[PDB]
Design a protein around this ligand. Structure first.
Ligand code: K
Ligand code: K
Ligand code: K
Ligand code: K
Ligand code: K
Ligand code: K
Ligand code: K
Ligand code: MG
Ligand code: MG
Ligand code: MG
Ligand code: MG
Ligand code: MG
Ligand code: MG
Ligand code: MG
Ligand code: MG
Ligand code: MG
Ligand code: MG
Ligand code: MG
Ligand code: MG
Ligand code: MG
Ligand code: MG
Ligand code: MG
Ligand code: MG
Ligand code: ZN
Lengths: 176, 209, 38, 16, 142
RNA sequence: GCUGAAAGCAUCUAAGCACGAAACUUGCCCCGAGAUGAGUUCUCCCUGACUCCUUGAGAGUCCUGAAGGAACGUUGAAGA
RNA sequence: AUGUCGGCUCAUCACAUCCUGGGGCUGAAGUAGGUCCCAAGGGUAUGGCUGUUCGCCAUUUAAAGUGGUACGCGAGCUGGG
RNA sequence: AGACCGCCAGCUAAGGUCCCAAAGUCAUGGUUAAGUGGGAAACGAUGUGGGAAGGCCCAGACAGCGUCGAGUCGGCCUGCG
């Protein structure tokens, strides 16, 4: 509702394309496309998208609020793009990007090689840092979580793949 | 990948220089001749039909003779089909030799097991015998109880009982290919395979591998 | 995870949430507080 | 406890 | 003067074709069962099959309400001890979509020889094509 | 878990998306078209005359007897 | 007249899981545990004593699960009680 | 609801009217999303409908960070889950 009320601006160099329910947002960074819920009415109007409930649906407002938030992020995706940073804490823990493959070394007896999806690119500022870049906010989120899964931060020394801005609550081993 | 049809010649051993005796079944694999090719358009699946061996012309009925004639191959002792993988291709009339197995490390071998006739539960299902003595009355090798009581008041399907044993299709999987002698039409496989000496064997590259 | 008939907020940070027809308590700070009704 | 005696035989009678 | 009775040798049976696409399974099935039995004809006779032949196309696109698509379970027993098997509506549609309509209709037809005969007049196809042009089926909207 | 509103936040869930076990469906082995919903493919065989009747998927006579099958015999690591 | 304990033979189901599989929390450093959730595919001792079931004991095992089936099973055996 | 017998007539009772299986896929207005309906308790819970008050509120509240701009907060009774 309150999210759905606020219309999202369409900056210059951003081309919308409403095709019933299917939307397509094009820009400099990349191309994104989605299919909205059938209870969402979307209008281009004056170079600013606005959302509201189609009638005959009880969940119209809720569905509009999410549709708004998604399109808002599709806009920022094709312009600025999204960025996630992952630290590797732990002795001997290293990463290495090789095209669209991240070769991890996470204290296993075998090499971890995560194949990246379509519109994601990774970097290695240092050995113990990965920087993901992409248009889709959901996909970059997934990939980051996938990498974190390999070796989640443990609560005694905080060893493992963590997000840059993640508070890892540690605790002491029981006395005696 | 396709297989070949062969004949169980018998068992022997190969001595290795490093002083190991390998027990081998000797499988004679004559040329398998393609009699028919099945395709999706006509048959709905891809396969070859092959024949092997020979047959006296007077034992070949007219329906069978016509089938061999269309292919332009000599009558063999039977027909067997092999499903084709997507890459494979064959033509009617083509011979396939045991050279097929030149690079194959392990095979599955299918045959008809020896026939034991009507077998008891001790032999057929490894049931335990009851006491030989200590008062047992006429119930030394009999199967014991075959069910519960009023619930369920029946015997369940698949209950293990006396019956025909052997004389059925059996596959032994993942046998080592010890030797492939194209010139003698021989395949040596390590270990025993189903059937009596002289029986037909189907040999295929191992599915598990 | 504590599985109980009676699930409750134990602290202020505890949040009740229904997921897939099941009441849960989630607590960022204290994993001990994690509960599922069952 | 047992609710029946162990089976026993009957005396012979002229059968027909 | 006795009440009329249809005669198997003189009864006229027509061919119809129905599109299952987006139809609610149970509400389609009742209409099929009605027509297979011949309850829509004035010559309806309970011991005679007076019904019509019906082709059902696009069985794979039949609809169900609620969470039935994932939660409706089909059970069968193989007859071997422990041999209770099950499949969700979703699994059935993937493996054998025609069975879903056939099962729904069979359960709504009389049990016995006549009901089995009636069911033989239903021809269910997963897709949009059939091979009964020779029977010249008329389109039937259900 | 990701994205994400309802609820300006938060939230794995409502829309959407991703992982996830010897369980489930397959994959392996065997049976299997009486699967009466009785399926498919290949090959082989038969190309006479006449009469009658309540006229039809009718009956009868003569000629013809195929492909193949069965019987019989010698038998089998097949078998009561 | 619906033969009764235990043994033997042959089982079959439940899951409130003994092992193996997956997971959350831990007063979880590791190893090893505790506890709860999911899971029924398969597996799940041999002996001494006693009519025993059980139990105790010896020695194993990944484990020696708990129950239902006329306290499963004598027109299948035994007949110690 | 009390069968004296016959009828290939008609009207009703309880109970019913999508198909099995006779009769509404009847009408109008609500509720439920649980296949609840079609098995059960203490107790638990921002499920959702209705009703009556109250506190705060363009002298700028509640949420997020002095800033931003309209309804919101937490109990009561009650329907269905
Ligand atoms: K057939
Ligand atoms: K048992
Ligand atoms: K199990
Ligand atoms: K009893
Ligand atoms: K008995
Ligand atoms: K006996
Ligand atoms: K129900
Ligand atoms: Mg034999
Ligand atoms: Mg023994
Ligand atoms: Mg005696
Ligand atoms: Mg004896
Ligand atoms: Mg019964
Ligand atoms: Mg009936
Ligand atoms: Mg295993
Ligand atoms: Mg359980
Ligand atoms: Mg399995
Ligand atoms: Mg008993
Ligand atoms: Mg006896
Ligand atoms: Mg008995
Ligand atoms: Mg009336
Ligand atoms: Mg009716
Ligand atoms: Mg209506
Ligand atoms: Mg219910
Ligand atoms: Zn808490």
């Amino acid at each position: 509702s309150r999210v759905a009320k606020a219309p999202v601006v369409v900056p210059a160099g951003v081309d919308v394309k409403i095709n019933g329910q299917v939307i397509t947002i094009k820009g400099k960074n990349g191309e994104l496309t989605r299919t909205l819920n059938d209870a969402v009415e979307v209008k281009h109007a004056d170079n600013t998208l606005t959302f509201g409930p189609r009638d005959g649906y009880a969940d119209g407002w809720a569905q509009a609020g999410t549709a708004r938030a998604l399109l808002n992020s599709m806009v920022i995706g094709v312009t600025e793009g999204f960025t996630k940073k992952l630290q590797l804490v732990g002795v001997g823990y290293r990463a290495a990007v090789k095209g669209n493959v991240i070769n991890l070394s996470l204290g296993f007896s075998h090499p971890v090689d995560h194949q990246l999806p379509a519109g994601i690119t990774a970097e290695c500022p240092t050995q113990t840092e990965i920087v993901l870049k992409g248009a889709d906010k959901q996909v970059i989120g997934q990939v980051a979580a996938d990498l974190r899964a390999y070796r989640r931060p443990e609560p005694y020394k905080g060893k493992g793949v963590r997000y840059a801005d993640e508070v890892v609550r540690t605790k002491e081993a029981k006395k005696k | 990948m396709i297989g070949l049809v062969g004949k169980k010649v018998g068992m022997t051993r190969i001595f290795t220089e490093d002083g190991v005796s390998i027990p081998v079944t000797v499988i004679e694999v004559e040329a398998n001749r393609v009699t028919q090719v099945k395709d999706l358009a006509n048959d709905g699946y891809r396969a070859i039909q092959v024949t092997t061996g020979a047959k006296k012309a007077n034992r070949v009925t007219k329906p069978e003779a016509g089938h061999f004639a269309k292919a332009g191959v000599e009558a063999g002792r039977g027909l067997w089909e092999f499903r084709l993988a997507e890459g494979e291709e064959f033509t009617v009339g083509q011979s396939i030799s045991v050279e097929l197995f030149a690079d194959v490390k392990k095979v599955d071998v299918t045959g008809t097991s020896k026939g034991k006739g009507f077998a008891g539960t001790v032999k057929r299902w490894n049931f335990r015998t009851q006491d030989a003595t200590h008062g047992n009355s006429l119930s030394h090798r009999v199967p014991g109880s075959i069910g519960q009581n009023q619930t369920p008041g029946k015997v369940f399907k698949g209950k293990k009982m006396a019956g025909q044993m052997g004389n059925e299709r059996v596959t032994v999987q993942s046998l080592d290919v010890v030797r492939v002698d194209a010139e003698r039409n021989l395949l040596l496989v390590k270990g025993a395979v189903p059937g009596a000496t002289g029986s037909d064997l189907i040999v295929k590259p191992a599915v598990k591998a | 995870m504590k599985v109980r008939a009676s699930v409750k907020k134990l602290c202020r940070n505890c949040k009740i949430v229904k997921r897939d027809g099941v009441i849960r308590v989630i607590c960022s700070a204290e994993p001990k507080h994690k509960q599922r009704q069952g | 406890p047992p609710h029946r005696p162990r089976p026993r035989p009957l005396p012979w009678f002229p059968p027909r | 003067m006795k009440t009329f009775t249809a005669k198997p040798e003189t009864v006229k049976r027509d061919w119809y074709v129905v599109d299952a696409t987006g139809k609610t399974l149970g509400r389609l099935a009742t209409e099929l069962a009605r027509r297979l039995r011949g309850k829509h004809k004035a010559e309806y006779t309970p011991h005679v099959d007076t019904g019509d032949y019906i082709i059902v196309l696009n069985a794979d696109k039949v609809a169900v309400t609620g969470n039935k698509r994932t939660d409706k379970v089909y059970y069968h027993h193989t007859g071997h001890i422990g041999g209770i098997k099950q499949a969700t509506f979703e699994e059935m549609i993937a493996r054998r979509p025609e069975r879903v309509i056939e099962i729904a209709v069979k359960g709504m037809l009389p049990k016995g020889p006549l009901g089995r005969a009636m069911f033989r007049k239903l021809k269910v196809y997963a897709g949009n094509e059939h091979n009964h042009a020779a029977q010249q089926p008329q389109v039937l909207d259900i």
